[PDB]
Enzyme design. Structure first.
Site, PDB file in Angstrom:
ATOM      1  CG  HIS A  41      -0.352   0.195   2.521  1.00  0.00           C
ATOM      2  ND1 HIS A  41      -0.328  -0.811   3.469  1.00  0.00           N
ATOM      3  CD2 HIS A  41       0.208   1.282   3.113  1.00  0.00           C
ATOM      4  CE1 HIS A  41       0.262  -0.364   4.566  1.00  0.00           C
ATOM      5  NE2 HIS A  41       0.598   0.899   4.376  1.00  0.00           N
ATOM      6  N   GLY A 143       2.841   5.848  10.538  1.00  0.00           N
ATOM      7  CA  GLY A 143       4.192   5.670  10.027  1.00  0.00           C
ATOM      8  C   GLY A 143       4.842   4.353  10.392  1.00  0.00           C
ATOM      9  CB  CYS A 145       2.880   0.519   7.550  1.00  0.00           C
ATOM     10  SG  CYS A 145       1.211   0.447   8.049  1.00  0.00           S
TER      11      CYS A 145
HETATM   12  C1  LIG Z   1       0.810   2.050   8.764  1.00  0.00           C
HETATM   13  N1  LIG Z   1       1.611   3.027   8.613  1.00  0.00           N
HETATM   14  C2  LIG Z   1      -0.584   2.283   9.335  1.00  0.00           C
HETATM   15  C3  LIG Z   1      -0.811   1.519  10.649  1.00  0.00           C
HETATM   16  C4  LIG Z   1      -1.706   2.108  11.633  1.00  0.00           C
HETATM   17  C5  LIG Z   1      -1.560   3.664  11.892  1.00  0.00           C
HETATM   18  C6  LIG Z   1      -1.955   3.916  13.364  1.00  0.00           C
HETATM   19  N2  LIG Z   1      -1.929   2.565  13.942  1.00  0.00           N
HETATM   20  C7  LIG Z   1      -1.739   1.580  13.079  1.00  0.00           C
HETATM   21  O1  LIG Z   1      -1.549   0.392  13.254  1.00  0.00           O
HETATM   22  N3  LIG Z   1      -1.538   1.837   8.328  1.00  0.00           N
HETATM   23  C8  LIG Z   1      -2.679   2.482   8.032  1.00  0.00           C
HETATM   24  O2  LIG Z   1      -2.751   3.713   7.962  1.00  0.00           O
HETATM   25  C9  LIG Z   1      -3.900   1.590   7.791  1.00  0.00           C
HETATM   26  N4  LIG Z   1      -4.995   2.240   8.493  1.00  0.00           N
HETATM   27  C10 LIG Z   1      -5.277   2.013   9.790  1.00  0.00           C
HETATM   28  O3  LIG Z   1      -4.562   1.291  10.505  1.00  0.00           O
HETATM   29  C11 LIG Z   1      -6.563   2.719  10.280  1.00  0.00           C
HETATM   30  N5  LIG Z   1      -7.596   1.726  10.569  1.00  0.00           N
HETATM   31  C12 LIG Z   1      -8.556   1.335   9.682  1.00  0.00           C
HETATM   32  O4  LIG Z   1      -8.944   2.082   8.754  1.00  0.00           O
HETATM   33  N6  LIG Z   1      -9.100   0.087   9.820  1.00  0.00           N
HETATM   34  C13 LIG Z   1      -9.998  -0.696   8.932  1.00  0.00           C
HETATM   35  C14 LIG Z   1     -11.401  -0.065   8.866  1.00  0.00           C
HETATM   36  C15 LIG Z   1     -10.112  -2.080   9.591  1.00  0.00           C
HETATM   37  C16 LIG Z   1      -9.391  -0.855   7.525  1.00  0.00           C
HETATM   38  C17 LIG Z   1      -6.424   3.857  11.354  1.00  0.00           C
HETATM   39  C18 LIG Z   1      -5.330   4.860  10.927  1.00  0.00           C
HETATM   40  C19 LIG Z   1      -5.953   3.193  12.669  1.00  0.00           C
HETATM   41  C20 LIG Z   1      -7.737   4.613  11.621  1.00  0.00           C
HETATM   42  C21 LIG Z   1      -4.177   1.239   6.295  1.00  0.00           C
HETATM   43  C22 LIG Z   1      -3.031   0.405   5.668  1.00  0.00           C
HETATM   44  C23 LIG Z   1      -3.360   0.062   4.201  1.00  0.00           C
HETATM   45  C24 LIG Z   1      -4.666  -0.755   4.147  1.00  0.00           C
HETATM   46  C25 LIG Z   1      -5.818   0.086   4.731  1.00  0.00           C
HETATM   47  C26 LIG Z   1      -5.977   1.385   3.914  1.00  0.00           C
HETATM   48  C27 LIG Z   1      -4.671   2.200   3.990  1.00  0.00           C
HETATM   49  C28 LIG Z   1      -3.520   1.366   3.391  1.00  0.00           C
HETATM   50  C29 LIG Z   1      -4.350   2.538   5.464  1.00  0.00           C
HETATM   51  C30 LIG Z   1      -5.496   0.435   6.198  1.00  0.00           C
END
Ligand SMILES: *C(=N)[C@H](C[C@@H]1CCNC1=O)NC(=O)[C@@H](NC(=O)[C@@H](NC(=O)NC(C)(C)C)C(C)(C)C)[C@]12C[C@H]3C[C@H](C[C@H](C3)C1)C2
Ligand SMILES: *C(=N)[C@H](C[C@@H]1CCNC1=O)NC(=O)[C@@H](NC(=O)[C@@H](NC(=O)NC(C)(C)C)C(C)(C)C)[C@]12C[C@H]3C[C@H](C[C@H](C3)C1)C2
EC number: 3.4.19.12
Lengths: 306, 306
Positions: A41, A143, A145
């Site tokens: 992603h 950040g 990921c």
């Molecule tokens: C990685 N950098 C980050 C991890 C997150 C950030 C804060 N805590 C974490 O573990 N990845 C993301 O930004 C992903 N989003 C989330 O973790 C997100 N949660 C969320 O939308 N959950 C569902 C509804 C289950 C998808 C919050 C920021 C915690 C609200 C992702 C990673 C990839 C797949 C998907 C879309 C984007 C790309 C962002 C989730």
């Protein structure tokens, strides 16, 4: 003596972390030999993640769309490809600090250390377990990921986890290093939830042995039970059923303490049915299930790593 | 989100650990520039430790009585001297992996990471606090002496602890890196015990803020109290008194959550007086006092290290 939530030394992994930028998105990557592994992603923009189509998104990128920094050094990306949910970036330089390593897909109940990273830089290390619902109870901020989970066996670093997302219950979901998610999750912004969690029974027993090894004996009794009898009580309280492999695994601990697994099971049955009554075990007022039998042996007999 | 017992990445310290043998005794040493630091009791035999006389014992040793191994490489000892309870062994080679470092004597309540080692080899890392009685609740087996505790500030490794002994209550005692014990302990086989421990109040409050930051709000109430009123309740339950410096330290956390320190104190007063009633906070059924205010900020805002 003593018993702590203990992580593996992180030095061999710290030297493999790099920063990866594509467009406006920056996250962490793992640099082994001449390949950088990172979540796919990173090639997304906000307009995409509703239902991104990663085949299309990747075809529209070239090697120069990817900025890889190891410290201050930029690495030149000479190739790219996708394996499941991970991106592999061929770079022109092989990491001279590449340890002996392998990629392992772990089972629920197993533990590993997480090296939490931001912008390619290690922030901290901690220990956690793959839950039976294929989430981990981590600590991750924006950040993070691409941060990886690992074990050390003798000298070999076994990578088992790469971080991707946080679920609405505040728990975390990711993939193995070949990009396959643990559990039923996908890398899209769609509604997802973890299944119900259960307590890892073989690990609770291992921790009761650790407690005995360290002088906390107040919960022992003279009774025994049977696997069949114990498991009947376990499911009533949302514990994983105990198997004969589990019993065999606990063998070394049974041997060192002189308490038979089935003896220990009758103590655990007792604790489920009457609680702990304000007493503690190893400093905890709850039964702890994030230590495996091997973790207890490692910490109560002193194995090192080279 | 999430909250874990998180240690500092250990890579910069792992490269400084060596093995030190004198006679039949082997323990760990810390190799920085051309000096190896280790506990002075490595020069003892069993006949000595009743009441060893370290001045005499050291005068009877020569440089070739000391075997220092960094991995497989032997290092040649070209000088030796004693500072308080540590031995300094001048060696002929300066450690090329010496990080930017300093030696700090910490205060009770502060936390640090411990890199537990055996025969010069890192076995695991974990986080702990200097208790108010100058012990730590560690995890140490035979051969662990010379293992060090440290913090990382930006790029500088601050060494603050070197391990020497375990007390009959199963807790641990050691020195700073200039060889001065924390607390009233001495390096002799004589009867010693820790004083009574107390709970680190400023750290419990920091952890309640972490809980709020992570969505555990059930213990909040609308009341306020005064420092004077709170401290009166605290001593009744063996908590450290809270000071104005403590209040000021908690400022950032108060600011980010909108809860005033004195508000939070009225919640803590409440928890002391009625307990938790089978509820948990951040996964714990006990009030946790081994996170400092800086630890909470670091983990809930994401600072890295270079
Ligand atoms: C990685 N950098 C980050 C991890 C997150 C950030 C804060 N805590 C974490 O573990 N990845 C993301 O930004 C992903 N989003 C989330 O973790 C997100 N949660 C969320 O939308 N959950 C569902 C509804 C289950 C998808 C919050 C920021 C915690 C609200 C992702 C990673 C990839 C797949 C998907 C879309 C984007 C790309 C962002 C989730
Ligand atoms: C270091 N290698 C080791 C640390 C110990 C070993 C197991 N757990 C630990 O933390 N150091 C020692 O062997 C010291 N002894 C003990 O820790 C000892 N406890 C003890 O005798 N306590 C009192 C009565 C308070 C002194 C047990 C092994 C746990 C039973 C020392 C270190 C030096 C000073 C003093 C004499 C020797 C040299 C052994 C204690």
């Amino acid at each position: 003596s003593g018993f702590r939530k203990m992580a593996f030394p992180s030095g061999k992994v710290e030297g493999c972390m790099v920063q990866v930028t594509c467009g406006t998105t920056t996250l962490n990557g793992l640099w082994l030999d001449d390949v950088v592994y990172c979540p796919r992603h990173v090639i997304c923009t906000s307009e995409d993640m509703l239902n991104p189509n990663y085949e299309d998104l990747l075809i529209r990128k070239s090697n120069h769309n990817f900025l890889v920094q190891a410290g201050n050094v930029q690495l030149r990306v000479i190739g790219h490809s996708m394996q499941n949910c991970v991106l592999k970036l061929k770079v022109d330089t092989a990491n001279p600090k590449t340890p002996k390593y392998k990629f392992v897909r772990i089972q629920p109940g197993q533990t590993f250390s997480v090296l939490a990273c931001y912008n390619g830089s290690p922030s901290g290390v901690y220990q956690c377990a793959m839950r039976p619902n294929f989430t981990i109870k981590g600590s991750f901020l924006n950040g993070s990921c691409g941060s990886v989970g690992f074990n050390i066996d003798y000298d070999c670093v076994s990578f088992c986890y790469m971080h991707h997302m946080e679920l609405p219950t505040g728990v975390h979901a990711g993939t193995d290093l070949e990009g396959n998610f643990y559990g039923p999750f996908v890398d899209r912004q769609t509604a997802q939830a973890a299944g119900t969690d259960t307590t890892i029974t073989v690990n609770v027993l291992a921790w009761l042995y650790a407690a005995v090894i360290n002088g906390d004996r107040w919960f022992l009794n003279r009774f025994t039970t049977t696997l069949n009898d114990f498991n009947l009580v376990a499911m009533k309280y949302n514990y994983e059923p105990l198997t004969q492999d589990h019993v065999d695994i606990l063998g070394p601990l049974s041997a060192q303490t002189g308490i038979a697994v089935l003896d220990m099971c009758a103590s655990l049955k007792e604790l489920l049915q009457n609680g702990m009554n304000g007493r503690t075990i190893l400093g905890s007022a709850l039964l702890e299930d994030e230590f495996t039998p091997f973790d207890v042996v490692r910490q109560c007999s002193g194995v090192t790593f080279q």
